[PDB]
Amino acid sequence: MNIFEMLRIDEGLRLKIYKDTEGYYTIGIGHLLTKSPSLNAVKSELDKAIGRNTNGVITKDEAEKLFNQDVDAAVRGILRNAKLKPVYDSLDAVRRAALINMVFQMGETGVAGFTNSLRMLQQKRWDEAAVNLAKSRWYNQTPNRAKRVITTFRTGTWDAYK
């Protein structure tokens, strides 16, 4: 297992425009297009992202390219963030994937906002961090996914994805 497979499991793959759990327009492997409701704004964003006149549909290869750019960007975001980087550097390879998963889903700002959890992860207080992380809107809204990520932080194994 690795980051790509993990996220592929949590986000699915859809080749036509769809709304995410929060109702926002997305496509592919969790690629958020826009928070706007206009199907126009949406079509524009897609065309611009893909570089061609779409019509709300993309190929698998196009979805994969966007996915690769997204993972890259999430990693890059962690490495640039002063609150995130230190945590990421302190973690083992499996746990690093859990953190990237969170960033991809909720953005750098969102995650950097879990101060308490972040400090507990840095101190390697796995159980404590898992409890803290559970006390969040994120877990309440997407509990199955949040439970998979949390377990991964708790155990440092891929067991939740197996």
Curated annotation (Swiss-Prot):
GO-annotated biological processes: cell wall macromolecule catabolic process; defense response to bacterium; peptidoglycan catabolic process; viral release from host cell by cytolysis
Family indicated by similarity: Belongs to the glycosyl hydrolase 24 family.
A GO term, aspect molecular function: lysozyme activity
Primary location class: host cell
SUPFAM superfamilies reported in the protein's UniProt record: Lysozyme-like (SSF53955)
Reported induction: Expressed late in the viral replication.
The protein's name: Endolysin
EC code(s) of this entry: 3.2.1.17
Gene that this sequence comes from: E
Stated pH dependence: Optimum pH is 7.3.
Enzyme active site: 11 (proton donor/acceptor), 20 (proton donor/acceptor)
Keyword Hydrolase attributed: yes
Organism expressing this protein natively: Enterobacteria phage T4
UniProt-reported outcome of changing residue 132 to M/F: 2-fold decrease in enzymatic activity
Pfam families: Phage_lysozyme
